[PDB]
Amino acid sequence: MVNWAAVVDDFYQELFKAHPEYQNKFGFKGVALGSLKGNAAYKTQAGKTVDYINAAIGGSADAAGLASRHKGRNVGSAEFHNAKACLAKACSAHGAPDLGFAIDDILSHL
Numbered sequence: 001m002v003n004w005a006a007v008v009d010d011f012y013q014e015l016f017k018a019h020p021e022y023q024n025k026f027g028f029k030g031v032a033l034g035s036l037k038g039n040a041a042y043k044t045q046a047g048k049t050v051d052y053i054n055a056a057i058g059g060s061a062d063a064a065g066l067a068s069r070h071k072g073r074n075v076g077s078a079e080f081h082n083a084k085a086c087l088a089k090a091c092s093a094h095g096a097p098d099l100g101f102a103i104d105d106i107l108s109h110l
């Protein structure tokens, strides 16, 4: 199966490399990027992001709900447009399908 866990790991590396300040909103704030896999808060978050991708692909994803929850953290359209770029890089690096369509679904509610 597509190794979405590996894609998500690469996604967060790209996201926080380009926008380190985004990391301050998570429970793993301040942790060196190269050590995230050893951080408990990160393990949980990465698992949820993987779950969301599989839900988007599987058809059960609540894009409206995820958008609203991100708005609830002052994360909106600009951040998700930036995320689209990082996730595209991460997917391509693993020979996985691009997930732009899934991000666009979220963006449609932002």
Ligand code: HEM
Binding pocket: 022, 023, 025, 026, 027, 045, 048, 049, 052, 053, 066, 069, 070, 073, 075, 079, 080, 083, 084, 087, 103
């Ligand atoms: C591909 C883009 C993204 C996906 C698929 C995604 C997915 C998710 C998911 C599934 C959750 C858990 C929601 C829940 O528990 O109900 C979450 C939480 C969160 N997301 Fe994202 N996200 C994305 C982009 C971003 C970006 C760019 C930021 C920038 C700050 C961000 C900030 C957060 C924060 C702060 C939380 C809450 C974490 C916590 O509870 O400690 N997300 N995201």
